[PDB]
């Protein structure tokens, strides 16, 4: 339990050893989730990179937020991927947010408070519970096989993961700075560990 | 009666089975009408899609709001259509509303509160009374013949239909959120039914 | 001419020298009028005060919006007054405004968008054209005889006056913030002058 | 005499029969004039069209406000014309107003409150009095010879014509909506006549 | 320098020894100021207490935010006091903020984002620079003479003092949690000192 | 002596007879000056033109503000000129202001309140005392030799000439409208003379 | 000691004699530093130029803020250089400044308050103490060898050097105008010396 308020992780150089793991105290399978966070990187025009990696035993790409080169964010559940295209690119800390529900397959997506159209992905799926979370590397296995081309170089922080779908009002509250309380991955009581060259510095985004 | 406030229908996948019907129990022909509604989709740059379909026995496209690819909205009365060109495209929940009158043929059109140039269409026509309304599919018959290419993928809600022409002040009130009361198709007294995969979710637009 | 958008006048102390005059370039008698404006003061529980004063040569109280103590607003035309009772009092920027017509004498009244019952006052009257408008003081003459007990201490702004009756839709538009264009006293082209301790400050009400 | 406040003419289709006449009660030659009017059309990118036509006996193009294709408005007095070039085009109700003075030849021009550079045209001219005004058609004779390609399709209203030069303050007052009093062509006491399919509808512009 | 984010001071018992001093690095006299701060106490119904005390050499009550028993907050400048009455009392962390300008004497007041009417106080005054700030005690001298009856028992934090007047939008951002940067008394770089039984604990208000 | 406030000169046609002369009552040579004024023309996309011409006996181009075509303003002192690049052009009344000091050669330049980079020109020069000022024509001699291609067509006014370097805050007050008092060429006490077609009209810029 | 508030240095011409020297009273090696300053020049589109030059005995390019042509600013430490590209260019007084720490090699970058992505540079380096600072010239030796092509022509001022890393809040305070106190190079007690044609003039940026 460590309060990471106003602090964010820093990935200055690309390497297959700089990464952090996150421990989820949840012991029940997931029927719905909502995981989003802040990040600031410059690789949005040079090569692809991962943002949030959630890999389990039977699947190395259970939940993976990946940024496709010249397309945009590529969200995926269980292995099937959907594309959220963007015709332009900016240089600023982006705060995207997405949700998912197995009961209806709706996949919401937000970009800096602006919402995107809902899509279907893995209707009736069942996300596991015992899994490993890696921020900065796209693991192709349960805790390893990091891709140098898919690695992340920049800043990252304010990770929050729920176990249900958040209303638009709750998403606006998260984007603005209002009070909240996660139940799966709390940024105020995160239980993480540092591996490689991962330094903690104050956040740049307000 | 079912109150659909703050809720909207969602269409994540294109299909000829995902659609809803709207009951119009009015037993009097229509000499004028006005319908405003919200919609949020990204198909404005890939292929055409339908928005509002009002089909009767003698005509499948009595009142039909269609989005033509690379031109814009294509409103039609009785079968003859007019074009409202838009040189650019945006990514945001758009709120359109149009009017029509048989006594003068004037066809108004509003896009997010901004008015468009008036046009003449079907002077002296007589819209029927008994009809079927379908949101998301272009029905080429009385309750069937849905086109997969003309289907809709996105969100839709707050559909309200009157039986006369609304003043510009009334249209501004509708766009802002002020009080109102439709007399043909009320979003607060909608009598609808679910067919296919059509779920109710909170609206994204404020 | 001076654009007074987002700005309002302030009266911090009660005095017979702090007041502002408003020049109406109209040269035609008025058979109907409608003026709406904002005001925020705390004198609603200690003593009476004036809000909108419109005095002419033959009558010092042609159009005068006064707040009577322990009853409410006291609107008057030509000298005859009517009472709009309020059993309670609030502490917030209140937006009230009324209308009047000589053809029928109907006097509407609105309080923060909520309408009041219509009343009759001065059926067949003829409001003069050459007159002086004073905001903050109850003038008992053509530009003088200011009452210290009836003076105003607080804020005032967004004064807009028409020469006809506004529909409920236009009233709701004014209350919400939609576009409009006054034709008697425009807040965007107000031709006023400062006298006494009257400072310009940003408005508190949204 | 008919009050045309908040109402405007509608030209939905192009034709040589759709036009309106305006009766000027002035019986004295004109040494200066100023006309402001609203108009909302979509023909600003397809073909030219007329806005204000003032033709007399000895000249069919005494005063003619014409919109040239791909350049802009082409104002003219007596027969000699000058060009007010616009490098871009918009889609919104535009409010133009221009002035002229025979004593100095100065030709002012305003576009939505923004002024244009002054120019000279017909120094020492003398505009006649007995003439016919046509809104929507470019007449090539005294009350006839309407051009099909030079027709107007859209809305028009709030036409006011003075007999002198208006100060920039008065022009801003007109643009914002403030009080005024014409003496040659009053929109509040217009004496007009209808011909063809010309319907009166509430204005779209605020 | 010490960052006091998410932390607040605690005054559990009334004593003439428990207080905190604040060092202002400003060496220029003040013509305007604005102090927003949080506080949560229960003495709002038992006896009076001080909130913000700013005393100098020539005046022991230069700037003093005091809560009068059964009346409300009693703001004062230089020695002249003004009353902001409130007929109701609540038990919750209240966020008040006030401003002042020597050029106009206007003194604003905000209570949990809700604004109060503006008043005049000490027009043309000049607040000194070399002074001592004490939170929790009403000092009757330059660093002493604390009143046990006027002492404070509760929590206080997030004190921020500017050197000018804040706009309503800035006050709204302060109350909500938006970014800001003080120039006289920064809660993120407070240079304070502890005295007596004053412990730092996480804040209760969100 | 005459007040030229709120009025500006008008040049409707290009001619070698339209110009205005200004008498400077100063009988001492100039070591520094500051000259700025308002102007509104459309020639900035067709051909070059002069703005402010200050010619003396020994030099026809002592101080001359010229607008080069496809580059921008070309300031000069004594005969040596410099270039101020503007990669774009606008259609609006532009208010530039520049200064110069012989003791350091520094020449400043402002554009509608926005400042430009500092440069050096004629270090140690000595501007003469007796001269003729011509607005609208580029004189190649002491009161003659006007170039038709370098003439000015548009409006001009607000001419002010100091005899030293003005501070940035003074430039800001000049651009906004604050009080000032020239000592060489006052717009409130200008002693000018008319020649050609030069009419006085109210200014368009606020 | 000299207070250089509201004043800035001016380099009007490129030359090998115009430069300013800065004396650092620090006698301890630097493990972290932070330089912030203002600058306004027009050479950002013609050729490269230096901004901040910090050369030592064993290294002529220890700390050098250089603007590379058609890419952007090129910060370097010890000899290794990293490029901060900018796809566009502006004409305005720009305020950029960076930080650095040898403990982890993290290097920040801010552009008018907007932060840039963090990078690694010279992990474990040790910046010397006895060095010479030159503003306007890129010294290739300890106090000489200035490049004419790399010289600076424009304005510069408000130079402040710390000996640690500044928080984002402190950076925002510096950018806004709040108080601060350097410990190695204070703009309020700068110990400099003039050489060549370097004149002091009031700053243009607010
Ligand atoms: Ca994988
Ligand atoms: Ca991989
Ligand atoms: Ca059909
Ligand atoms: Ca079909
Ligand atoms: Ca009276
Ligand atoms: Ca009285
Ligand atoms: Ca003709
Ligand atoms: Ca023709
Ligand atoms: Ca005291
Ligand atoms: Ca006491
Ligand atoms: Ca010459
Ligand atoms: Ca020449
Ligand atoms: Ca070097
Ligand atoms: Ca070099």
Author numbering:
A (entry chain B), B (entry chain A), C (entry chain F), D (entry chain E), E (entry chain G), F (entry chain D), ...: 1 to 206
Could you share sentences copied from the article?
In this study, the effect of physical and chemical factors on the orientations of macromolecules was investigated through an analysis of selected well studied macromolecules, and important parameters that determine the behaviour of proteins on cryo-EM grids were revealed. The test proteins used in the analysis include human C-reactive protein (CRP) pentamer, CRP decamer, human erythrocyte catalase, SARS-CoV-2 spike protein, E. coli PaaZ and E. coli β-galactosidase. We performed a comprehensive examination of how macromolecule orientations respond to alterations in physical factors, such as freezing temperature, and chemical factors, such as the addition of surfactants or the presence of affinity tags, during grid freezing for a standard set of proteins. Hence, electrostatic interactions at the AWI are an important factor in determining protein orientations in the absence of any additive.
CRP exists in a concentration-dependent equilibrium between a pentamer and a decamer of a 25 kDa polypeptide under physiological conditions. In the concentration range used for cryo-EM experiments, both pentamer and decamer populations were observed in the same micrograph and were analysed separately. C5 symmetry was applied to the smaller pentameric molecule and no symmetry was applied to the decamer during image processing. The CRP decamer and SARS-CoV-2 spike had a more severe orientation bias, with more than 90% abundance of the preferred view, whereas in the case of the CRP pentamer the abundance was 50% and in catalase it was near 60%. The negatively charged B-face of CRP in the absence of additive is less sampled in the case of the CRP pentamer and is not sampled at all in the CRP decamer. However, this scenario does not seem to be applicable to CRP, as both the pentamer and decamer populations adopt preferred orientations in the absence of additives, indicating their interaction with the AWI. The orientations observed in this case look similar and the resulting reconstructions from 256 289 and 204 354 particles for the pentamer and decamer (C5 and C1 symmetry) resulted in resolutions of 3.2 and 2.8 Å, respectively. In comparison, we have obtained a 3.3 Å resolution map for the pentamer and a 4 Å resolution map for the decamer by averaging 25 000 and 51 000 particles, respectively.
